Ligand binder design. Structure first.
Ligand SMILES: [Zn+2]
Ligand SMILES: [Zn+2]
Ligand SMILES: [Zn+2]
Ligand SMILES: [Zn+2]
Ligand SMILES: [Zn+2]
Lengths: 49, 586, 134, 585
RNA sequence: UGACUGCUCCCUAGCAUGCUACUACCG
RNA sequence: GCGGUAGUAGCAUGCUAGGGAGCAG
């Protein structure tokens, strides 16, 4: 196993790193959509007369 | 969520948790930071702590990767994988890691609690993202400083200019004067509204509110704080001197009121930045207004530490320039308001480091370089990427009040990254046009620090004074009161009633809170003084300590006189130099 | 501007169904169970054909968030359920969360208030607004 | 998904690091990838490790995950290296033939176009190499022009002058009108409508083609287009028919062009003929003679410009009826006597710019030397005709090579057909020297022209010889010399009848200095042929390889009907020229 | 510009489990 | 001669996930 159960970690580490890659993206898309929603609100109120 | 680390500039996702400002750190580079400190908590997209329900462990190497989680050994599943290993802590981009062999520079800044002058020798003699981290750490820990103190409850009100005031429990007390200006706000039944800008001094509580208001019961004050967010541009760009002043507009006609000015501007358009040797009242406020006419086509960036300092830049603003071409952004503070306000796309935009918005302009002119540090130094360039740059002022007039520096005060010379430059590269400009003080004081300040450099203005009418005294001082809370010299003050001020047409100068301005009741004489703040002055100023230095008679602090107080200041130099610090009229002490 | 019509519904009930011996709650918020809701919404269905159709739909209100005035929906006036008021409405809010940003971008209040009037003569359904120029 | 260049087998890979990204064949693509840094290859999807957020992009550096391509740092246990077997993994992996020596192809691809060796490659290559080469030149040069600042007119002083700066960090475009800008103006948001401009010695002298008056913030750059690939060859595999069948033998003829009819007769017995066309040898007259000889021809008149086909349209309606000519001018102000926007037209003149694609009768191409292999294949990609003719001569004028640095390329390999009249020989010739007399013509015949062009007329001793030196001092993108400019009036003074001439000069800013001294008009050296006076004053103002090389201002000497001026400060060809010499005052 | 459900087929991946064979160690 | 564990491959079933599609209200 000094070569065949660890190799199984070179699996788990890869998977965990991929998952947290994905979650970092998912948290950047969130901030982007938040900026978008709030700038829409603040640009549509200024029409309010 | 994910950026480039300081010590590496590789793209990382790890922020030192125990570290104050939490900068992005690179895997190998983060490990180097974690191996030498107690900064032993690191946050990635999620914090690296054992998420077994209700645990305690929070050191990084203390944890192992348990699948979807991070655990301690007391929790780790049989299949684990230590997070901190391989000489490289586990995070995103684990391949692109370069580190620095000696990061104890970085750890030293991070483990710097800012007590000694060594701390600011670190803050300057560091490297760069170190420099912004340093300035920002100073600010952060000092706005955390101010609020370790009580809530200033005005709980009875007696008279005007006086309050009955207590504070919260367990906390020491903020000092006596207005570098620590409060900004309290009032409640109703539920939450917290408006009061204003206040400070409390020797009463009985003397409050000097900037705006008009009358206070009630339960009225409380604290030094309300903000959120110092990080800083981008460098303190100063990697500058260089052009080959011709191309892109800049050579004008035909000139005003020789400032003949000490035009030869000074000509290469400034042939160069990125010039910080000038600006001795007090050497037409420095006049200086930047001369180029205003020389290059009236310049979107020239007038900035200072305040619209009490850029106030001086706006002093002769419309007096020299047409009106609608000046503007200042005052955010939602009462100072100068002759201009049109809230117009950034303006030909001449004056402002303070507080709130001029971010644009691109022509030539920067920065008043107040000594007292401002590396933080707001990078602010104007983070504000603005201009044609060229100028800093007006001088490390030869004052530093900032260092709330946490405790051992010996730092050099005049390392005030900031550019302040060393006129002491390691030399002065980029100079102005010896002494329109203010005469042969009285000026060269005696030239034989002081100024290179034997500033000539006489005028005759020496023997009006700035010498008195060789001693005095007796006793201490209190955050001041020092001495009347053996205060007794000398009227004793000085009496033998000619023409004496007392002067402004009292004094370090421990409560010593004027005792003097104002004796004389009626106005007050002079020692450090917030330059720009303001009379020909006649009475000064009781009332202390000889490192607080007091150090080289360049009340240096700003001696040069206040057009012709006639008073100096009861109870110090042997620099008295061995000063060349003025001496008399017997009655 | 009138939207309540709670006294009018009671006067109608008393004029036509005087001896119907079962409590009539004009606003179905006061109903006791789902059968009482059906009972009283039945009457609201009839009595709402009398009142002007511009008085139904969200009841907006000018709130202040970050010192700026929004117009947001703090209730509703159903033809079947009467007037319903939101319970957690707050006027001076410092900043919005994700959830509040959501529930304010979804309301038709800010959208309709900031659009052109619309008179669409192709249909008979009560048009409200034209969120565009064409 | 098409056929690869070096193989013509149907492939799906396109070299990613390569500039123009041609289709490459699996084995053939591997051959290209083994010898360059062109180490990125795109198939239907790009061959790069799609593990979330990686860096690796070399091809052999990757292995076939299943639905993906990974590096070793990402590859799943079950992998399969993409680049192996001597054959890179793509569609049609079976039909691959390659070429044993493709360093021809790699050499074109790794060619950054600096030396004349680059264009020796561009011509002495093989075919789809040839179109790839010309198209690579164009691509990298329209990428060239925009490495430069945005020409902001940021103050306006007077007319014919501007206050103008540019963007940051960029060097500056040169001085004259081979690099014509076409700026466009903004409002608050986006970019709409200025025009065609160029900036020269002022103070910024702008020579706008159309009428307009500029404002503040007004900016200019050399707006670019998208060079899309070519199709037809530069020239078909041609052959000479057995009789001029399908072509219409006419009974009557005009012997104004008796130097013409024996020239056309076999041209209908043949596909293409490029003609030896010396300057003003009735070459513009030549193609108009066949116009009457075969008035039944849909004959394809094309040139490098409606400043050059301008000359083809000079005697167009003067010789042909009106409604049978047409020129397509796309949505540029030049000739507009014709009906415009009519391709189905008996006579269609145009430029390589925008004559649409059809099939016609006999091609006649002005400007063959300055145009290269790109637009050479354009007219045949435009048009598959009966037969072909190219008017002009490599004995005129090449193109301005923006990237050629070391040692200008031969007159002889201007293009694929230009070698032919130097390896096969001239298909036609015209020695009908209607223009210059015995003065210059044979002295240009003993130059490069085979001792071939006869005298027109007497030798009135009006083209001149001056044995001088001058002193030159440089600036941005010009060269200014007044020891010869001082000679100019010094030449021009002793008879005020001198100065009824057009100034010739290489560094046309040297006329921006001369025009204020004389009032004399300007002559561009290279954009000159077709235009001329009997009287032209010329200060060559330089003897460098820019200057007194064999066949550049060759076009400037032959401008005179009878009387040009040549202050030959050069020892380059002065050892030849046989004209009137005097002392230098 | 693409709604809410439900079912079904096909392809791939993962994991465990389950089944069978080959080899190895020890009792 | 047996047991056991460990390995590896083959094979199956199932569950999850990802993708492509079809029908229905
Ligand atoms: Zn730290
Ligand atoms: Zn734990
Ligand atoms: Zn009810
Ligand atoms: Zn390539
Ligand atoms: Zn990879």
């Amino acid at each position: 196993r000094d070569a065949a159960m660890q190799r199984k970690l070179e699996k788990m580490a890869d998977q965990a790193m991929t998952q947290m890659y994905k979650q970092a993206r998912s948290e950047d898309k969130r901030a982007k959509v938040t900026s978008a929603m709030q700038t829409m609100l603040f640009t549509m109120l200024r029409k309010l007369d | 969520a994910v950026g480039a680390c300081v010590l590496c500039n590789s793209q990382t996702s790890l922020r030192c948790g125990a570290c104050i400002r939490r900068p992005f750190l690179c895997c190998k580079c983060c490990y180097d930071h974690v191996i030498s400190t107690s900064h032993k908590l690191v946050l990635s997209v999620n914090p690296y702590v054992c998420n077994a329900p209700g645990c305690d462990v929070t050191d990084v190497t203390q944890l192992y990767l348990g699948g979807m989680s991070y655990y301690c050994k007391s929790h780790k599943p049989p299949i684990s994988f230590p997070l901190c290993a391989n000489g490289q802590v586990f995070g995103l981009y684990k391949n692109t890691c370069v580190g620095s062999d000696n990061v104890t520079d970085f750890n030293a800044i991070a483990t710097c609690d800012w007590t000694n002058a060594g701390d600011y020798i670190l803050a300057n003699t560091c490297t760069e993202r170190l420099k912004l981290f340093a300035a920002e750490t100073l600010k952060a820990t000092e706005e955390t400083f101010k609020l370790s103190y009580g809530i200033a409850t005005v709980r009875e009100v007696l008279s005007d200019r006086e309050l009955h005031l207590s504070w919260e429990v367990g906390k020491p007390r903020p000092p006596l004067n207005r570098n620590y200006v409060f900004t309290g706000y009032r409640v109703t039944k539920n939450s917290k509204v408006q009061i204003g800008e206040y400070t409390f001094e020797k009463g009985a509580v003397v409050y000097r509110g900037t705006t008009t208001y009358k206070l009630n019961v339960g009225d409380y004050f604290v030094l309300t704080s903000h959120t110092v967010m990080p800083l981008s541009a460098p303190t100063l760009v990697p500058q260089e001197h052009y080959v011709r002043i191309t892109g800049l507009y050579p004008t035909l006609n000139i005003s020789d009121e400032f003949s000490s000015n035009v030869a000074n501007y000509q290469k400034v358009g042939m160069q990125k930045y010039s910080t000038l040797q600006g001795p007090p009242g050497t037409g420095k406020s006049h200086f930047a207004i001369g180029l205003a006419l020389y290059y009236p086509s310049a979107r020239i960036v007038y900035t200072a530490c305040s619209h009490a300092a850029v106030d001086a830049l706006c002093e002769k603003a419309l007096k020299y320039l047409p009106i609608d071409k000046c503007s200042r952004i005052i955010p939602a503070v009462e100072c100068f308001d002759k201009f049109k306000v809230n117009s950034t796309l303006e030909q001449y935009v004056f402002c303070t480091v507080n709130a001029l918005p971010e644009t691109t302009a022509d030539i920067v002119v920065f008043d107040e370089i000594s007292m401002a540090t590396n933080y707001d130094l990078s602010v104007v360039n983070a504000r603005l990427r201009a044609k060229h740059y100028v800093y007006i002022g001088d490390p030869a007039q004052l530093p900032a009040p260092r709330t946490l520096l405790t051992k010996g005060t730092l050099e005049p010379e390392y005030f900031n990254s550019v302040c060393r430059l006129m002491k390691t590269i030399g002065p980029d400009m100079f102005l010896g046009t002494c329109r203010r003080c005469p042969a009285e004081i000026v060269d005696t300040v030239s034989a002081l620090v100024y290179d034997n450099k500033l000539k006489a203005h005028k005759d020496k009418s023997a009006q700035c004074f010498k008195m060789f005294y001693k005095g007796v001082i006793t201490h209190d809370v955050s001041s020092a009161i001495n009347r053996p010299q205060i007794g000398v003050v009227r004793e000085f001020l009496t033998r000619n009633p023409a004496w007392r047409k002067a402004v009292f100068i004094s370090p421990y301005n409560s010593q004027n809170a005792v003097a104002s009741k004796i004389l009626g004489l106005p007050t002079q703040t020692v450090d917030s003084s330059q720009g303001s002055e009379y020909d006649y100023v009475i000064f009781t230095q009332t202390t000889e300590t490192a607080h007091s008679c150090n080289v360049n602090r009340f240096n700003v107080a001696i040069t206040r006189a057009k012709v006639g200041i008073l100096c009861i130099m109870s110090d042997r610090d620099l008295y061995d130099k000063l060349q003025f009229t001496s008399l017997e002490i009655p | 501007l009138k939207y309540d019509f709670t006294e009018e519904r009671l006067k109608l009930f008393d004029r036509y169904f005087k001896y119907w011996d079962q409590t009539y709650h004009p606003n179905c918020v006061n109903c006791l169970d789902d059968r009482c809701i059906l009972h009283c919404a039945n009457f609201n269905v009839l009595f709402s054909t009398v009142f002007p159709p511009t008085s139904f739909g969200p009841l907006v209100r000018k709130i202040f968030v970050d010192g700026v005035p929004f117009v947001v929906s703090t209730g509703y006036h159903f033809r079947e359920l009467g007037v319903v008021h939101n319970q957690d409405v707050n006027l001076h809010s410092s900043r919005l969360s994700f959830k509040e940003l959501l529930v304010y971008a979804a309301d038709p209040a800010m959208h309709a208030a900031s659009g052109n009037l619309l008179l669409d003569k192709r249909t008979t359904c009560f048009s409200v607004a034209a969120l565009t120029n064409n």
